[PDB]
Design a protein around this nucleic acid. Structure first.
Lengths: 219, 118, 177
RNA sequence: AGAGGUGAAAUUCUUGGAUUUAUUGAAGACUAACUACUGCGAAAGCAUUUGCCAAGGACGUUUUCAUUAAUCAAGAACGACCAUAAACUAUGCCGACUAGGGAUCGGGUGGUGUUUUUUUAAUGACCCACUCGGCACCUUACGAGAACUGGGGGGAGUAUGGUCGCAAGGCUGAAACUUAAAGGAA
């Protein structure tokens, strides 16, 4: 039948840019279109549930985070800016596919933790069994009592590294991968365990807004 | 100095989709699929159809102001083929040939992780 | 051009005496496409990396397929047929079709065939290169052949014999010509 | 303004906006990669974490009971609503039977180097020898190895004055009628 005609919708979009919080280095991550702020559904309301999924290599400037994409959720918006908070962290799928090789065991743990705020996180971890130098046998499998003991010490150490961090302190904690060195130093009297990672931090529920804390996080 | 969008190339068998969105992924800058640029209904997955679709996507992208695109390429995935079909290389090649700078190519196919077959 | 891309797979230990011999030919075959690549034997890895002179954006994905094929133990002259545009990989997954190990290994040996006849006939009819390995079936080839071999392998893991599908392929070839 | 899907199409969804993208929520099923000639179970079978419940195995033992044991006919346990597959190229010389070899899984003993580490309680990983027991694999030496049922006897052919059937004619119309219209054939 008869369908519709056209009116160009990129005249009524607005180019808001996105600011990253002060936990990172250089923090102007990009821009975003949204419909212009008319009355009855303004733009600052059509935002604020928007996440951007950017790469930590850009958010830190150095290339040795070329994996590890992180998510920023828009919460405050002012001055044609977007004021974003830490909403997640992932790996790219080709990272963990570049890690998994057979004749070893992958131990993985995940805890449901609450930070020093009323944020709750499901934070994951993966860790691959290593064969030592001077090991002749090809396998280096774990004996599954060692898998329980390693998963226990991993769950204990990352539920201790949260509850003792804020989201600012925890994003600042998982920028220079230092929970990984904590896990490895805690684990090296059970099994060797090459390339421990955290692989995933999931926001589950967030406390309230607290605009002053958001603005203090930014600066 | 660039303005970055994201590509969202879905390169299945039987079809391809070049769908540039903004850096959030919410608002859409010119989704044109492969099956509308040439239509005999069997030629729709082709490198030629992906070439036409990606070229006019990049035209509208430089119209709106996007000079560079992060590329995220996916297959049909799930409990199915998991390989980027024939349009993916051609859509990425036309999106790079038509002016846009290319950043951060990443496979984003849904690896099903214990799927629902039997 | 392209800013930076890098992919990496990691190979099992027995392959390294082979990869060390074919490595100059991978380096030449990628350096005609302007891609760097390293072979790290102290971990057992292979990385492909987009250089500054890489003017093709989607060539790093074919180099990714190349190093993961050399990890999955196809030969090199059958492996660098992936760097050309009409070719693609596939890994059909057959571990999760049936319950008992007796029926599983008999259906997989039904896929390979008596003296390899079913596998070589399917390779000829679909113009593909198939490796039945473990509980998965790798394949390279054109896309029509890849869809053909996927439905043949999954139908062979269900109960219908692969020689029926091969007869239908011969019939369909003669009806297409 | 197409999307499925196909060798091509089609059924189908779609300006009440499909497909794609983003956020969110639910429902059912499953437990990818790690996944191996490896582990467990009487077999059928068994892969997310954590807890509880009982159980099983080998090993260790200068513990205890004292022939309680092995074998299988019988028998016992496991194995009115929405509908589904199974086998399909395969293999080897059998048992009372000798040594082994490399690897691997579980336990144990010894050796003395590196990963470990320290005055919170333990618990390691690897290497080497020995050893016990497993799923397998590659060789070896030596032995009578006999006293859900229903069946004729080889392979490849060849021939037929027998028995039992099928099967050719020849333009239809159209035969009692040398007969239309329309068609086949040339």
């Amino acid at each position: 039948g008869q369908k519709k005609r056209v009116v160009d919708p990129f005249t009524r979009k607005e180019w808001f840019d996105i600011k990253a919080p002060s936990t990172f280095e250089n923090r102007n991550v990009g821009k975003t279109l949204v419909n212009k702020s008319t009355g009855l559904k303004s733009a600052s309301d059509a935002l604020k549930g928007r996440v951007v999924e950017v790469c930590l290599a850009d958010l830190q400037g150095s290339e040795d985070h070329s994996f590890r994409k992180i998510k920023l959720r828009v919460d405050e918006v002012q001055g044609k800016n977007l004021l974003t908070n830490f909403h997640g962290m992932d790996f790219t799928t080709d990272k963990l596919r570049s890690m998994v090789r057979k004749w070893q065991t992958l131990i993985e743990a995940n805890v449901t933790v609450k930070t020093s705020d009323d944020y709750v996180l499901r934070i994951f971890a993966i860790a691959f069994t290593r064969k030592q130098a001077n090991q002749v046998k090809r396998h280096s499998y774990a004996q599954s009592s060692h898998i329980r003991a390693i998963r226990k010490v991993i769950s204990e150490i990352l539920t201790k590294e949260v509850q003792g961090s804020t989201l600012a302190q925890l994003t600042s904690k998982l920028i220079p991968e230092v929970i990984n060195k904590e896990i490895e130093n805690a684990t090296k009297d059970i099994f060797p365990l090459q390339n421990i990672h955290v692989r995933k931090v999931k926001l589950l529920k967030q406390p309230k807004f607290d605009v002053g804390a958001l603005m203090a996080l930014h600066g | 100095s660039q303005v970055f969008g994201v590509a969202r190339i879905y390169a299945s068998f039987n079809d391809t989709f070049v769908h540039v969105t903004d850096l959030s992924g919410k608002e859409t800058i010119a989704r044109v699929t492969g099956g509308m640029k040439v239509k005999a209904d069997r030629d729709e997955s082709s490198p030629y159809a992906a070439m036409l679709a990606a070229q006019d996507v990049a035209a509208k992208c430089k119209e709106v102001g996007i000079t560079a695109v992060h590329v995220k390429i996916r297959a049909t995935g799930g409990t199915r083929t998991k390989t980027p079909g024939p349009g993916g290389q051609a859509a990425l090649r036309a999106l790079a040939r038509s002016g846009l700078r290319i950043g951060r190519i990443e496979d984003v196919t849904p690896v099903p992780s214990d799927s629902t077959r039997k | 051009f392209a800013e930076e891309s890098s992919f990496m797979t990691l190979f099992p230990k027995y392959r390294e005496s082979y990869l060390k011999t074919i490595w100059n030919d991978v380096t030449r075959a990628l350096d005609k496409h302007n891609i760097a690549c390293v072979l790290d034997l102290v971990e057992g890895s292979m990385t492909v990396k987009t250089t500054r002179k890489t003017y093709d954006p989607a060539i790093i994905l074919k180099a990714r397929d190349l190093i993961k094929l050399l990890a999955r133990s196809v030969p090199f002259p059958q492996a660098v047929k992936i760097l050309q545009d009409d070719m693609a990989c596939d890994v059909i997954k057959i571990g999760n079709f049936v319950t008992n190990k007796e029926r599983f290994v008999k259906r997989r040996q039904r896929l390979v065939g008596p003296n390899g006849n079913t596998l070589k006939a399917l390779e000829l009819l679909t113009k593909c290169y198939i490796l039945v390995q473990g509980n998965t079936v790798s394949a390279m080839g054109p896309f029509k052949g890849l869809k053909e071999v996927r439905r043949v392998v999954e139908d062979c893991m269900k109960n219908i014999h692969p020689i029926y599908h091969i007869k239908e392929l011969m019939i369909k070839r003669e009806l297409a010509k």
